[PDB]
Write a protein that binds this ligand. Structure first.
Ligand SMILES: [Pr+3]
Ligand SMILES: [Pr+3]
Length: 279
């Protein structure tokens, strides 16, 4: 299948070179997989989700996304127009308040929740969790991410936006998950993207158009935007049977565009998420 005039990030993950405008993908499009978006919530009623999005848990007074951030990330995972895996099932877990913040204890509870909740869902092709959040280093937060991964969920987390070594941030610094840096449409490391040896992969993160609350759209930037590209890519690959939750990050790294990025510090991987689609 082919989506013409796609957002640049979708086109980039189906090309060996920057500058293309078509997103090439297999028609299966992540059908039968599930992605938990652990964030500010999801505006599930947005037309772009086509009824495939559902709030399953909130840690605040409402399950509504009063912020937009979670809806944006969810859109990059699996919205019709802006999503990588256009037929995946989306589950929202609201661990961040409408200001975009949350206590570590709540974020940990949300991860433990997903590990259990997935056992009550029909996700025959597998389960992904997308975490576009983080803060200063915490061994408890890292441990929670490692548990979630161990439970059989592909965990993708943002590297952080501090232009620093991600070793000092959580859950970015947990080695066993998939830590995602950001790039721009000219294949440069995004100027805000964290780096370091703990990064596994880069994805498009600068000027990413996706869904927003109030049934709208907007373009924003961050490693928050790169992470759902990789989460959606994992769902897509799991549906195709190419990989499993345990090995998806490694498979994505193995099959990535290599050496294409500029402004990558020595010691950081030069790997850009790529779906390897061949008609
Ligand atoms: Pr290339
Ligand atoms: Pr890793």
């Amino acid at each position: 299948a082919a989506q013409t005039n796609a957002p640049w990030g979708l086109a980039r993950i189906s090309s060996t070179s920057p500058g293309t405008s078509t997103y090439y993908y297999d028609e299966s499009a992540g059908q039968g997989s599930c992605v938990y978006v652990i964030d500010t919530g999801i505006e599930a009623s947005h037309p772009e989700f086509e009824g495939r999005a559902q709030m399953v848990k909130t840690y605040y007074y409402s399950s509504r996304d009063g912020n937009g951030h979670g809806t944006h990330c969810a859109g990059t995972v699996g919205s019709r127009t802006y999503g990588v895996a256009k037929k995946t099932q989306l589950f929202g877990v609201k661990v961040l308040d409408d200001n975009g913040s949350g206590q570590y204890s709540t974020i940990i509870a949300g991860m433990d929740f997903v590990a259990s909740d997935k056992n009550n869902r029909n996700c025959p092709k597998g389960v992904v969790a997308s975490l576009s959040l983080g803060g200063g280093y915490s061994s408890s937060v890292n441990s929670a991410a490692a548990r979630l991964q161990s439970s059989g969920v592909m965990v993708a987390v943002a590297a952080g936006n501090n232009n620093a070594d991600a070793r000092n941030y959580s859950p970015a610094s947990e080695p066993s998950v998939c830590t995602v840096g950001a790039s721009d449409r000219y294949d440069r490391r995004s100027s805000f993207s964290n780096y370091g040896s703990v990064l596994d992969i880069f994805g498009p993160g600068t000027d990413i158009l996706s869904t927003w609350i109030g049934g709208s759209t907007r373009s924003i930037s961050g490693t928050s935007m790169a992470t759902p590209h990789v989460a959606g890519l994992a769902a897509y690959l799991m549906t195709l049977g190419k990989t499993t939750a345990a090995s998806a990050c490694r498979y994505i790294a193995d099959t990535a565009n290599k050496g294409d990025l500029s402004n990558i510090p020595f010691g950081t991987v030069n790997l850009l998420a790529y779906n390897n689609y061949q008609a």
